[PDB]
C-alpha cells in the first residue's frame, strides 16, 4: 500500500492549486482518502475526506468555501484543490488513509506530502557548490565535506549522498531564507580522512519545482 | 470541535528513562456502548509524515515496539514510553476520531538529555565555481555538540561581523543525540578579495574558551 503525491509548487495569492495523490496496492474504491495540512509552527489540520468509491466527500468548515476534493477511480488518484489562496495557506499538504480500522487489519498510510508556497515570487532552480575537504576541514582522523545549495525558490530541496549508500554522519541542514527572498541550504557528511584518495562522495540534489537534478562530486 | 490538549509542550529525559505525555479531550470520546475510546497516538520525525502508534487509545499498531503504550478514558489520556531510546526523539500527536471534524493535538516534543560534547569545528572557503559566478560564500560547520546553545562569530581581517551571516541547526541526531550547526558568511566577490583572513569563532559550553577556525584567502 502506497500513496505518492505530486511535486512542490508556488502559487500567486488569490490563485488556485490542485495537489494529486496516486494510490496503489489495494482496491482503490474500498477506502476513504483524507487530506490534512501542516503549516509551520501550527498543528495538523484535517481538511476533508472523500470516499473513493462513490466520490462522496465531507469538508471542514475552516476551508469549506475554498477546498475541493475529487478522485479519478480509473487512475486510482485523489485530488485536492484550494482556491482563493492566501499567505496562511503556505504549508505542507498530505493525502492519507487515516486509521483504517478494518476487522481483519489496521493500518495508517500517508503520502510524502507536498509543500505549497503562496507568493508573488517565481520558481528558481538552485546552484550547487561543493564544500571540499581540506586541511581546514579535518579534525582527528575524520574529514568534513558537503554541498552548498544556493539561491532556489520555493522550498524544498532534497539531498542524498552516493545515491543513498551514505547516510551515517550526514547532516542536511534546514534551509534559510536570505535577504533576496531566495533559499539556501547546506548538506554535510563526516568521513575518515585517511581514505580521501580512494572513496568517492557525490551529493544528489532535487528541486522538483524547477525540475533540477544535479549530482555533484566533491573532491579534495 | 473537539479540542486536543497535550502537556507538556517539551520534554527531555535521559536515555532509558520513562517519558509520559498527557492528552486531554475537550469532550468525552468514550462510547459507552462498545466501551471504546476513539483516540489515536502518532509519532512524527522531521521531514516525514506522522506514523501511527496507538489506536482505540491502547491498541498498539502492529510492528510498533512494546515500550510505547496508551492509557486513559473519557477525556484524559496518556502516552507512555517506558525506556526512551535515542531514536525516539520526535513529536508525538494525539488524535480524536469521535466527531467531525477530525482534530489533532498540538504535539509534544521529546528530546534526549545526555553528556556534554564540544563541537568539532570545520571551515570551508568558497568554491572557485561560486567565485566565477560573482558571489563568495564562506561556510562554518559545528558538528555533533551538546547542549544546543552555541554561538558563532565571523571575523574578516580580524574585524568582528554582524548581519552578513545566517545560521541553522539540525534536529537532534537520532543516534548520538547531538546537534549540528551551519553558518554561512556571504559577500560579493569584490569585497571577498579586499580581505585576507577569514575566521569563525565558536563559543560553546564544552569549550573553556572560544575556538577560532580561520584561513587566508
Amino acid at each position: 500500500v502506497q500513496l505518492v503525491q505530486s511535486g512542490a509548487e508556488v502559487k500567486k495569492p488569490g490563485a488556485s492549486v490542485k495537489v494529486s495523490c496516486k494510490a496503489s496496492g489495494y482496491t482503490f474504491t474500498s477506502y476513504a482518502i483524507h487530506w490534512v495540512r501542516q503549516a509551520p509552527g501550527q498543528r495538523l489540520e484535517w481538511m476533508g475526506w472523500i470516499k473513493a468509491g462513490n466520490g462522496n466527500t465531507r469538508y471542514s468548515q475552516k476551508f469549506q468555501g475554498r477546498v475541493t476534493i475529487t478522485r479519478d477511480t480509473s487512475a486510482s488518484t485523489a485530488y485536492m484543490e484550494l482556491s482563493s489562496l492566501r499567505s496562511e495557506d503556505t504549508a505542507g499538504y498530505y493525502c492519507a488513509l487515516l486509521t483504517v480500522i478494518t476487522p481483519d487489519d489496521a493500518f495508517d498510510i500517508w503520502g510524502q506530502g507536498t509543500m505549497v508556497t503562496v507568493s508573488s515570487a517565481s520558481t528558481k532552480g538552485p546552484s550547487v557548490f561543493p564544500l571540499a575537504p581540506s586541511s581546514k576541514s579535518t579534525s582527528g582522523g575524520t574529514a568534513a565535506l558537503g554541498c552548498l545549495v544556493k539561491d532556489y525558490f520555493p522550498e524544498p530541496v532534497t539531498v542524498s549522498w552516493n545515491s543513498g549508500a551514505l547516510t551515517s554522519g550526514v547532516h542536511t541542514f534546514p534551509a534559510v531564507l536570505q535577504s533576496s527572498g531566495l533559499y539556501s541550504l547546506s548538506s554535510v557528511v563526516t568521513v575518515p580522512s585517511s581514505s580521501l584518495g580512494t572513496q568517492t562522495y557525490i551529493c544528489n540534489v532535487n528541486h522538483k519545482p524547477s525540475n533540477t537534478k544535479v549530482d555533484k562530486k566533491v573532491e579534495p | 470541535d473537539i479540542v486536543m490538549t497535550q502537556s507538556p509542550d517539551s520534554l527531555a529525559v535521559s536515555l532509558g528513562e520513562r517519558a509520559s505525555i498527557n492528552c486531554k479531550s475537550s469532550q468525552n470520546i468514550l462510547f459507552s456502548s462498545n466501551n471504546k475510546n476513539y483516540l489515536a497516538w502518532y509519532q512524527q520525525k522531521p521531514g516525514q509524515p506522522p506514523k501511527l502508534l496507538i489506536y482505540w487509545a491502547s491498541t498498539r499498531e502492529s510492528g510498533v515496539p512494546d515500550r510505547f503504550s496508551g492509557s486513559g478514558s473519557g477525556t484524559d489520556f496518556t502516552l507512555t514510553i517506558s525506556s526512551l531510546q535515542a531514536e525516539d526523539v520526535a513529536v508525538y500527536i494525539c488524535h480524536q476520531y469521535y466527531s467531525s471534524p477530525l482534530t489533532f493535538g498540538g504535539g509534544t516534543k521529546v528530546e534526549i538529555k545526555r553528556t556534554v560534547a564540544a563541537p568539532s569545528v570545520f571551515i570551508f572557503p568558497p568554491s572557485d565555481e561560486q567565485l566565477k559566478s560573482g558571489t563568495a560564500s564562506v561556510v562554518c560547520l559545528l558538528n555533533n555538540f551538546y547542549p544546543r546553545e552555541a554561538k558563532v562569530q565571523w571575523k574578516v581581517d580580524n574585524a568582528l561581523q554582524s548581519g552578513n551571516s545566517q545560521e541553522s541547526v539540525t534536529e537532534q541526531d537520532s543516534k548520538d543525540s547531538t546537534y549540528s550547526l551551519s553558518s554561512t558568511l556571504t559577500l560579493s566577490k569584490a569585497d571577498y578579495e579586499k580581505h585576507k583572513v577569514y575566521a569563525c569563532e565558536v563559543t560553546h559550553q564544552g569549550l573553556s574558551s572560544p575556538v577560532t577556525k580561520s584561513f587566508n584567502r
Binding site: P103 | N34, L102
Partner: peptide, 15 residues
C-alpha cells in the same frame, strides 16, 4: 455518541 462518518475507514465493531 460517535459519528461513524467522522472517518469512514473506522469500523466500530472492529478491534
Amino acid at each position: 455518541n460517535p459519528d461513524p462518518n467522522a472517518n469512514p475507514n473506522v469500523d466500530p465493531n472492529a478491534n
